[PDB]
Design an enzyme around this catalytic site. Structure first.
Site, PDB file in Angstrom:
ATOM      1  CG  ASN A   1       3.345  -3.688  -1.357  1.00  0.00           C
ATOM      2  OD1 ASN A   1       2.690  -2.689  -1.648  1.00  0.00           O
ATOM      3  ND2 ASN A   1       2.817  -4.904  -1.318  1.00  0.00           N
TER       4      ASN A   1
ATOM      5  CG  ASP B   1      -2.646  -2.827   3.560  1.00  0.00           C
ATOM      6  OD1 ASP B   1      -3.096  -3.425   2.566  1.00  0.00           O
ATOM      7  OD2 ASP B   1      -1.674  -2.049   3.501  1.00  0.00           O
TER       8      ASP B   1
ATOM      9  CB  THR C   1      -0.936   0.036   1.207  1.00  0.00           C
ATOM     10  OG1 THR C   1      -1.695  -1.177   1.256  1.00  0.00           O
ATOM     11  CG2 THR C   1      -1.885   1.214   1.109  1.00  0.00           C
ATOM     12  CD  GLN C   2       4.710   2.665  -2.381  1.00  0.00           C
ATOM     13  OE1 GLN C   2       5.324   1.784  -1.787  1.00  0.00           O
ATOM     14  NE2 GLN C   2       5.104   3.932  -2.388  1.00  0.00           N
TER      15      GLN C   2
END
Ligand code: K
Lengths: 242, 248, 196, 242, 204, 216, 231, 237, 220
Positions: free
Chosen positions: F104, F59, F1-2
């Site tokens: 990441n 996430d 998750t950038q």
């Protein structure tokens, strides 16, 4: 019958028999019998786990595995291959829950593991698994399910099944039951009865009964039978054996 | 599986490669192809074994394969392996042309194909290429050349050689009759016709049963020309006259 | 920036190169040799980004020597130039391109003298004379003014000295000594360095 | 029937051009002990298979040979059960991928050809054995009407007006040929009549409804449907009255 | 830009049973002439030529790789390539590198080796064929080439007028382009001969 | 998750005598928007440990899936040994560090609370793998707003009762609702004891606004 | 899963690849197939004697188009024919994508022969059990080829393969000349099939395909009926 | 990829494939090499004397580098492969280590390659034995051989191929401090060694010579005939 | 570039200009932009000319192989699905803007496939640089179930509006009328523009150009 056409699972006999798979079945019918009976509210497994030497601990070489939170597994045959297939079934259930987001139906777990074991009945680079195993689950929305998978890879649902040396006698005595109308608390008692009947105390000296059910009594969780219920079942089986 | 493995790339107890030897027997039963190196050219003469009159023969040739601008080859052995080898030869010649921007020397192309055949007789378990080739070419280094190749990956520079059916008799005749450094194109053609006469004993050597191609140099350009039916007929008739004249 | 020059006469190829190897505002070496003898009759004058030049020159040298040993006859200067161009162009779009500017001087028994020019993009060009570096701008005008196809080797050396004097007079960088080599039918000949 | 080398062990040619492993795979199809009959009519296709329950402990709902490939294509499998399930899984995958890639449902002939190509790969390579099972696919094509197709281990596929595969395919084939030569404009009722009649006259059983399975497709209802005990019993009663 | 690094200029023109291809002869680096005899038109047969313009390194690489492929094709098929098939081959070769393209825009000019019908086409750097009946031009002075060709081309010219028209077009186009010129080479492909001749151009 | 998409705000936790308590509101915000208003951000990993996560809820859901499956496999083995809260904390730290190293990151900052072997465990782990143990933990704006009160209570009184810890958590979440733009009134409170993990909610914190009339 | 990496086809001590011989034996044991190259076309004919009326004749075809101008027929094992047809279609499409011209029939024959050669030498595989007759019209000239299991392709003016292929070849040799039109070629191919056909030959038990300037096409059963009635 | 173990240990510890490669070597043409004071000489027997052949294309003495050259007994194609790899390795070592390869280094490389083929999956051992001669940088002549098993030793003089034992015995009886005093004596020693096994003199001898700071030289047939004549006069007395 | 398509009562009318440009300078005046996908399906091409050409050729070859295997007329949905999946795989780097139309067993179908993989099934679609003008003409005049001539005139008007109101389109109008029974490829349908007649004479007489060197190479 063979000696030229029994060298690989990738070879057909002149009469269309894959002799290697039949030899794997020969291997699995030389193992202690494991029975499973399906009732209204679950399935109860049973194993005549022989103790080869008394130096082992009670609970060594378990033949009643637990492949998912709601699926049990009784095994017969080579225990190494049984454990390998138990890990394969565990991985299949884990992947199913990861992808589709809910518990794997046993009708699908049986099919997946049966196809996995069938993949080993085709090639000369591998050998067929020497273990036939049973799977049992109970969910409120799908009911109690009991399936057998043999080295060939055939999956069928059973109201009661036996795998091992005393398959025939165990099935003959299971047919006398009316499992379709009975409950788990009685089916465990009858499973102990069947195991003690089919066991021979003269060839294989000692064995310990390993039981486990999954059903409504356990909210779908496949658990080893509580110690007190196992003691009561063995007491009934010994008294009946007279 | 070791049970079904044919063990193609192994040694024999006496130290010979059976697969190469068997492929060489296959080639020895194949069509006769001989080449003669002359002072002003080099020629390939090849017996055609498929003579049946329902054949069409559309292409440039059936035995002689043009490898690049300055080279050609013939084949004795298996035709499909010949096709894959000749495609590989064309690829190698064009790869040199791309890399160096000049035509490939003949011995380099022969060496590359022979190295591939060696690879097939060294590792991998695959059967060897049952094809013996017969190269003719020209380069600015050694002039007109004639090269033989073997399934084992061996090659040799020859001034007159024959591969195929009745190869030993043709080699003996060439040894008796080849004149060192004094053989012109027409002399080489006559010798080729004479050798093919005693090699194709059963077939009586009609002009429909042989394919002759000459490699000469004209104005700095190499010309590879398959001999026409008329002029092969003329060669055969001239040889017949010479044979009749020998009785005189 | 480094300097190369070549003059193709009727029967020779005269090549000169600066000998300064500077990696800062200071010159680390004053006798650097940027000419590579690829064969008995081929010279590769390599300049460009550091590290790339020596590696590429030694690669082409290894391959030319391997050709000589494998075949028994040397590559022609045209063939060596095309091989060098092919390698540089193949590495042009690779992950590790070579940033080198090249001059390939050579002699062949048939083709005669040959001088080849290659930029870092691998654009090959046979020229009567060629040069690299910022000194090419100052010296190519003199080459155009005074070069004739039938120039003798002594007059070629005089013209090359005129070019080097122009560098010394109107070029900011200090290049005091230049190597000088000539490729004749007898091979590669080392001439006296032109210094100041 | 000459033999030289390993031609009876791996799929390489006998001196007469015969691959003995393929014929042994056909024998393996025979080894299942069951026979299947398929017949198509004016607007329907019917597959009828022999349903044997060797043991009363099986869940008869889980012992089937009619498999639903897609929502519109059916399948009866004769031969080794694990191999048959592998082949039906592959057919399902190929049909789904066809729909995903081409945007329209797979024709029955196309699916049969894909499965036959896979079978050919089995009979060309030497490390895997051919599957000892035979597939009979049915469906309704949009333009061509009812389809009946069969693929055997050799890799052969063809469309049939009426076919059969199993232990008694020759007698059933002869009977269906005698019925086809008459050409009396088969309806749905007549198609199921002739299928069940063929199976019964070849096996000499006079089935009760629980000893056979019937799967039908129709132009009116292109959905594949596995007939239940009620419908099969109704058809059998229709047989009896005549 | 990347195309203006080394300049370049090629055009082709059709006539009556004859075809013309022309190119400049300058090789340079953004300002600096290196050679006045760069080859930009390559022979792909007896009566078929391709003219590469753009990056000199890519010009040479494309020409040599195309000769590679064409020689293999001719050997396998035993026939001289047709111009349309050559155009398709070049399009495939230039589209193989669609995301790393060779920076050349070739022009193909030749005659059908069975009918001798003239053919001219051009392709972009990533393989877009363009078959015209009048003229195709490529290079860093394409606008001048369009202007001169449109003002000058007339249908059904004999080889003399075809040469005159292509010569005037190329000369006056490259005279208004700084990075292309230094001599013009023209080939007049005919039914039974090729006449290649070099023009008197400005060398500044 | 950038870059995160839907983020959970502060998650609290304080040790006490007999276990730990963690509180997190039931909101998933898409930037300023309060999109998902009844999402639970507290996981019961097993009978002995729990996990409240701030940051990206996608996430968090993925990591919840992975941890739940790991605990399921553990239970399948049925060999007495079970994952301690310390083991969960270490595994979580290793996972987050592995994800940062691959560039990441799992855009979560997590509070693990547990009670095994009569010892209370409160653990921290962030997207970069920074992990530690403290009597009280606060995440995000809770670290600036809630953590000072937790520390000023636990420094004077090192050990708190269950009721005192619960009251302190309620006060801190009230302060967060006052002074955090991404807070939501509804929240859950989860406690671990000898009895196990119990999640209470949706709790709402009472608020006082009497200073509204003062401001003019 | 990994396949064998050694050649099943190897040279016998006699110096001959016996596997190709056995593949050719399988070819010689299949249904007869004949091909006749007319001056303005070429005909490909084979028998479709199904072993029962139950088989649907329109379900499978033995004369399969490859491009709009190339078709092929076989004599051997049908599944191998299907595989080679698919591969030949792939090769034709690849050639079309590369050159934007329909593939020359000779080139397609060469590529199919290359595939057969691969299966002759590659590891763990047996040679194909089919000989193909590839027909095509291109460059204003009819073509006819035969590719044996080994991958050797021969240009033919008229040939027969399968059962009684030697007698069929003698028949063609006696009764073929250059000037035959396409219709005469079709008639002669039907007679050649009849020379070995057992029983009455009808529309559905023979499959005939032609290719001419208009391209390749299978003859529909009605056209085969018209041609059969001409005898 | 093919991964069968072609070379495996047999009972009694023999590697049969290596022994068979050695047997193939025994059937190759006789090759002799002698190390002199300031010259190293290699000689090979030509059973392929056939007169319709280009002598250049069947040379059995190849220059691995400017200072190393070798002659082989056994399969010709395997020898070509090993020679090509040896040349590549020579040039690579010259790039990486700046200096010309010593004879023992390329001998070690060739021996290692042969041994690797002796023990790696799916390839037979090289059926060639080599005679790697040359001069070191310090001017010390060298002579090595590499058998198919991969063992390399240094020899004053050796023979490989058919008649290796006969020529080896001859060299043992005829290699002294005086027999290699001059270049001509070494040439004659190698020719005399070959004459112990070759059918006819001169016409069946290929003889290459390497001396200090000079490349390999292939002695033309006339020089071989004049040398053989000199041995004829020497033997008369 | 202006490409338009419409579903009329019995099939599809696909239209396109014939102008290709390299910047603000015209390269081709008669480029063909209605590509052959299959005998019943044609694709109009916009965007990158090389990209659209290659994608249409690849899908046409794939669809021909599919039709040969199945022995049936190719379906338009099949071409749409292949095109959209393959364009999505390349993630918009294949700048193929396409107007797909064809008549199959299920009837006329018209699709608009965008470079990133999006597809819009619509009665009328306009793509290209001059898509706005063609779409305006469509919205003004399109009515469902038009006859062949009415739909042809409509697409001609749309392409003409693209020509005269966009600088990137022009120089002709091409139409393709796909119906159940017949295919009509009208190239060109109309020629609304034509270069004016050259007034002066600029013919170059022989000898005008000075020749430095010459080489005649006679051939066969
Ligand atoms: K097989």
């Amino acid at each position: 019958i063979g000696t030229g056409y029994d060298l690989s699972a990738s070879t057909f006999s002149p009469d269309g028999r894959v002799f290697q798979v039949e030899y794997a079945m020969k291997a699995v019918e030389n193992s202690s019998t494991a029975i499973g009976i399906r009732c209204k509210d679950g399935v109860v497994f049973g194993v005549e786990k022989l103790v080869l030497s008394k130096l082992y601990e009670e609970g060594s070489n378990k033949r009643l595995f637990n492949v998912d939170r709601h699926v049990g597994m009784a095994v017969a045959g080579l225990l190494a291959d049984a454990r390998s297939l138990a890990d394969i079934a565990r991985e299949e259930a884990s992947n199913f829950r990861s992808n589709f987001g809910y518990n794997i139906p046993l009708k699908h777990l049986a099919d997946r593991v049966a196809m996995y074991v069938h993949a080993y009945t085709l090639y000369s680079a591998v050998r067929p698994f020497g273990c036939s195993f049973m799977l049992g689950s109970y969910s409120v929305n799908d009911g109690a399910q009991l399936y057998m998978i043999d080295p060939s890879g055939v999956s069928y649902g059973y109201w009661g099944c036996a795998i091992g040396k005393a398959r025939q006698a165990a099935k003959t005595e299971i047919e006398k039951l009316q499992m379709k109308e009975m409950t788990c608390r009685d089916i465990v008692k009858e499973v102990a009865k069947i195991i003690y009947i089919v066991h021979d105390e003269v060839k294989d000296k000692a064995f310990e009964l390993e039981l486990s059910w999954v059903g409504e009594l356990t909210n779908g969780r496949h658990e080893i039978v509580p110690k007190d219920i196992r003691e009561e079942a063995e007491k009934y089986a010994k008294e009946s054996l007279k | 599986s070791r049970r079904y493995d044919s063990r193609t790339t192994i040694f024999s107890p006496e130290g010979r490669l059976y697969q190469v030897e068997y492929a060489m027997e296959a080639i020895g039963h194949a069509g006769t192809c001989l080449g003669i190196l002359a002072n002003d050219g080099v020629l390939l003469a090849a017996e055609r074994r498929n003579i049946h009159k329902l054949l069409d023969e559309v292409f440039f040739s059936e035995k002689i394969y043009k490898l690049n601008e300055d080279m050609a080859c013939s084949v004795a052995g298996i035709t499909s392996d010949a096709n894959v080898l000749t495609n590989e030869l064309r690829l190698i010649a064009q790869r040199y042309l791309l890399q160096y921007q000049e035509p490939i020397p003949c011995e380099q192309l022969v060496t590359a194909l022979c190295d591939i055949k060696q690879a097939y007789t060294q590792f991998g378990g695959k059967r060897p290429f049952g094809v013996s080739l017969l190269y003719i070419g020209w380069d600015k280094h050694y002039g007109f050349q004639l090269y033989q190749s073997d399934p084992s990956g061996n090659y040799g520079g020859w001034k007159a050689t024959c591969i195929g059916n009745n190869s030993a008799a043709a080699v003996s005749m060439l040894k008796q009759d080849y004149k060192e450094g004094e053989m012109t194109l027409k002399s080489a053609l006559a010798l080729a016709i004479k050798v093919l006469n005693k090699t194709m004993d059963v077939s009586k050597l009609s002009a429909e049963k042989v394919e002759i191609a000459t490699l000469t140099r004209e104005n700095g350009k190499t010309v590879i020309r398959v001999l026409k039916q008329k002029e092969v007929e003329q060669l055969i008739k001239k040889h017949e006259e010479e044979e009749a004249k020998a009785e005189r | 920036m480094e300097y190369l020059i070549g003059i193709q006469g009727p029967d020779y190829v005269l090549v000169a190169s600066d000998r300064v190897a500077a990696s800062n505002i200071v010159q680390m070496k004053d006798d650097h040799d940027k000419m590579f003898k690829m064969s008995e009759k081929i010279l590769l004058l390599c300049v460009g980004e550091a590290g790339d030049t020596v590696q590429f020159a030694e690669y082409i040298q290894k391959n030319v020597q391997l050709y000589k040993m494998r075949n028994g006859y040397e590559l022609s200067p045209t063939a060596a130039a095309n091989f060098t161009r092919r390698n540089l162009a193949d590495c042009l779009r690779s992950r590790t391109p070579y940033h080198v500017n090249l001059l390939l001087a050579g002699y062949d028994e048939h083709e005669g003298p040959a001088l080849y020019y290659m930029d870092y993009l691998a654009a090959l060009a046979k020229a009567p004379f060629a040069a690299h570096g910022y000194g090419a701008f100052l010296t190519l005008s003199i080459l155009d003014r005074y070069y004739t196809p039938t120039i003798s080797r002594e007059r070629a050396v005089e013209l090359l000295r005129k070019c080097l004097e122009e560098l010394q007079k109107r070029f900011i960088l200090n290049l005091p000594t230049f190597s000088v080599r000539i490729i004749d039918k007898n091979g590669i000949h080392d001439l006296d360095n032109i210094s100041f | 029937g000459s033999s030289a080398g390993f031609d009876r062990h791996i799929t390489i040619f006998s001196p007469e051009g015969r691959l003995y492993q393929v014929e042994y795979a056909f024998k393996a199809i025979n080894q299942g002990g069951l026979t299947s009959v398929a017949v198509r009519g004016k607007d329907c296709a019917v597959i009828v298979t022999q349903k044997k329950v060797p043991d009363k402990l099986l869940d008869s709902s889980t012992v089937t040979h009619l498999f639903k490939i897609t929502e519109n294509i059916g399948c009866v499998m004769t031969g080794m059960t694990a191999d048959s399930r592998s082949q039906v899984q592959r057919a399902r995958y190929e049909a789904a991928n066809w729909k995903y890639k081409y945007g329209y449902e797979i024709p029955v002939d196309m699916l049969c050809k894909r499965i036959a190509d896979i079978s050919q790969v089995y009979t060309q390579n030497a490390e895997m054995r051919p599957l000892g099972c035979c597939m009979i696919l049915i469906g309704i094509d949009e333009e061509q009407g009812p389809q009946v197709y069969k693929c055997d281990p050799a890799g052969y596929y063809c469309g049939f007006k009426a076919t059969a595969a199993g232990v008694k395919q020759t007698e059933s084939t002869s009977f269906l040929e005698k019925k086809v030569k008459k050409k009396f404009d088969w309806t749905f009722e007549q198609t199921v009549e002739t299928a069940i009649t063929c199976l019964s006259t070849v096996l000499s059983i006079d089935f009760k409804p629980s000893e056979i399975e019937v799967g039908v497709v129709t132009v009116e209802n292109p959905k594949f449907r596995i007939l239940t005990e009620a419908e099969i019993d109704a058809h059998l009663v229709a047989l009896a009255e005549r | 830009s990347i195309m203006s690094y080394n300049g370049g200029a090629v055009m082709a023109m059709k006539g009556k049973n004859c075809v013309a291809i022309a190119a400049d002869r300058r090789f340079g680096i953004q300002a600096q002439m290196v050679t006045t005899d760069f080859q930009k038109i390559f022979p792909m047969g007896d009566r078929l030529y391709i003219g590469l313009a753009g990056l000199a390194t890519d010009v040479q690489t494309v020409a040599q790789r195309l000769k590679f492929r064409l020689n293999l094709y001719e050997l396998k098929e035993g026939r001289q390539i047709k111009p349309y098939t050559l155009m398709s081959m070049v399009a495939n070769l230039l589209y193989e590198k669609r995301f790393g393209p060779y920076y050349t825009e070739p022009v193909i000019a030749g005659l059908d080796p069975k009918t001798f019908k003239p053919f001219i086409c051009s392709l972009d750097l990533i393989g877009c064929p363009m078959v015209t009946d009048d003229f195709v031009v490529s290079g860093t002075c394409a606008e001048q080439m369009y202007g001169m060709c449109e003002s000058l081309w007339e249908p059904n010219m004999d080889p003399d007028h075809l040469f005159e028209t292509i010569s005037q077009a190329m000369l006056n186009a490259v005279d208004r382009d700084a990075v292309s010129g230094m001599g013009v080479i023209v080939h007049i492909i005919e039914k039974d001969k090729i006449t290649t001749r070099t023009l008197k151009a400005r060398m500044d | 998750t950038q870059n995160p998409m839907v983020t959970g705000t502060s998650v609290l936790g304080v040790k006490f005598e007999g276990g730990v308590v963690i509180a997190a509101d039931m909101l998933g915000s898409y930037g300023s928007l309060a999109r998902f208003r009844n999402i639970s951000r507290i996981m019961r990993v097993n009978n002995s440990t729990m996990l409240g996560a701030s940051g990206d809820y996608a996430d968090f859901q993925y990591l919840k899936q992975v941890l739940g499956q790991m605990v399921i496999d553990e239970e399948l083995l049925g060999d007495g040994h079970s994952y301690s809260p310390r083991a969960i904390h270490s595994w979580l730290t290793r996972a987050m560090y592995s994800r940062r190293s691959k560039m990441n990151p799992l855009w979560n900052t997590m509070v693990i609370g547990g009670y095994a072997d009569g010892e209370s465990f409160l653990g921290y782990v962030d997207m970069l793998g920074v992990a530690y143990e403290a009597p009280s933990l606060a995440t995000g704006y809770g670290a600036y707003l809630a953590q000072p009160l937790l520390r000023e209570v636990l420094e004077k009184q090192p050990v708190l009762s269950q009721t005192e810890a619960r009251d302190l958590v309620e006060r801190c979440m009230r302060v967060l609702y006052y002074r955090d733009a991404r807070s939501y009134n509804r929240f859950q409170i989860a406690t671990v004891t000898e009895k196990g993990v119990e999640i209470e909610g949706p709790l709402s914190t009472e608020t006082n606004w009497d200073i509204a009339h003062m401001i003019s | 899963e990994r396949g064998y990496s050694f050649s099943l086809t190897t040279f016998s001590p006699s110096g001959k690849l016996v596997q190709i011989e056995y593949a050719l034996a399988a070819v010689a044991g299949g249904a007869p197939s004949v091909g006749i190259k007319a001056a303005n076309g070429v005909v490909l004919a084979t028998e479709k004697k199904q072993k029962s009326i139950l088989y649907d004749e329109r379900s499978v075809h033995k004369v399969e188009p490859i491009t709009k101008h190339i078709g092929l027929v076989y004599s051997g094992m049908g599944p191998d024919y299907r595989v080679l047809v698919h591969r030949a279609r792939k090769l034709a499409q690849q050639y079309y994508l590369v050159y934007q011209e329909p593939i020359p029939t000779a080139q397609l024959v060469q590529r199919v022969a290359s595939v057969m050669q691969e299966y002759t030498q590659s590891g763990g595989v047996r040679p194909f059990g089919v000989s193909l007759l590839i027909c095509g019209w291109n460059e204003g000239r009819p073509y006819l080829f035969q590719s044996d299991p080994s991958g050797a392709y021969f240009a033919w003016k008229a040939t027969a393969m399968g059962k009684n292929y030697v007698n069929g070849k003698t028949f063609l040799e006696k009764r073929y000349n250059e000037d035959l039109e396409l219709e005469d070629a079709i008639h002669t191919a039907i007679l050649t099939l009849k020379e070995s056909f057992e029983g009455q030959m009808t529309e559905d038990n023979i499959e005939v395909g032609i290719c001419n300037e208009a391209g390749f096409r299978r003859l529909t059963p009605t056209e085969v009926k018209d041609y059969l009635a001409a005898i | 990829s093919y991964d069968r173990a072609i070379t495996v240990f047999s009972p009694d510890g023999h590697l049969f494939q290596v022994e068979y490669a050695q047997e193939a070597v025994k059937k190759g043409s006789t090759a002799v090499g002698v190390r002199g004071r300031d010259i190293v000489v290699l000689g090979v027997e030509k059973k392929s004397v056939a007169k319709l052949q280009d002598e250049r294309t069947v040379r059995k003495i190849c220059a691995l580098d400017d200072n190393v050259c070798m002659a082989f007994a056994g399969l010709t194609a395997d020898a070509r492969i090993v020679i090509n790899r040896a040349r590549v390795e020579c040039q690579s070592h010259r790039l990486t280590v700046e200096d010309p390869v010593t004879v023992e280094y390329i001998t070690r490389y060739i021996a290692s390659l042969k041994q690797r083929y002796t023990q790696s999956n799916g390839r037979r051992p090289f059926g060639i034995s080599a005679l790697i001669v040359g001069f070191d940088f310090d001017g010390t002549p060298r002579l090595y051989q590499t058998d198919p098993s991969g063992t390399y030793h240094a020899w004053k003089a050796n023979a490989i191929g058919r008649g290796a034992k006969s020529v080896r015995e001859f060299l043992e009886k005829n290699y002294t401090d005086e027999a290699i005093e001059t270049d001509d004596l070494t040439i004659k020693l190698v020719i005399k060694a070959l004459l112990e096994v070759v059918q006819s003199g001169g016409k069946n001898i290929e003889l290459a010579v390497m001396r200090r700071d000079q490349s390999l030289k292939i002695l033309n047939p006339e020089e071989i005939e004049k040398y053989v004549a000199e041995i004829e006069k020497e033997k008369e007395e | 570039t202006t490409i338009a398509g419409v579903v009329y009562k019995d099939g599809i009318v696909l239209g396109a200009d014939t102008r290709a440009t390299e910047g603000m300078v015209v390269a081709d005046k008669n480029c063909s932009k209605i590509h052959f996908i299959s005998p019943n399906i044609y694709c109009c091409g916009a965007g990158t000319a090389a990209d659209t050409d290659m994608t249409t050729q690849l899908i046409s070859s794939n669809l021909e192989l599919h039709s040969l295997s199945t022995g049936r007329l190719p379906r338009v949905v099949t071409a749409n699905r292949m095109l959209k999946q393959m364009l999505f795989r390349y993630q918009g780097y294949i700048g193929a803007a396409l107007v797909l139309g064809g008549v199959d067993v299920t009837g006329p179908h018209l699709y608009s496939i965008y470079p990133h993989g999006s597809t819009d099934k619509l009665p009328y679609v306009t793509m290209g640089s001059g898509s706005l003008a063609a779409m305006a003409v469509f919205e003004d005049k399109f009515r469902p179930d038009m006859e062949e001539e009415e739909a042809k005139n409509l697409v001609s008007e749309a392409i003409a509006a693209g020509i005269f109101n966009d600088l990137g389109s022009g120089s002709n109008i091409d139409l393709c009328v796909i119906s159940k029974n017949k295919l009509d490829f009208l190239r060109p349908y109309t020629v609304p523009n034509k270069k004016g007649t050259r007034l002066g004479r600029y013919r170059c007489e022989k000898g005008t150009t000075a020749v430095l060197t010459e080489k005649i190479t006679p051939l066969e």
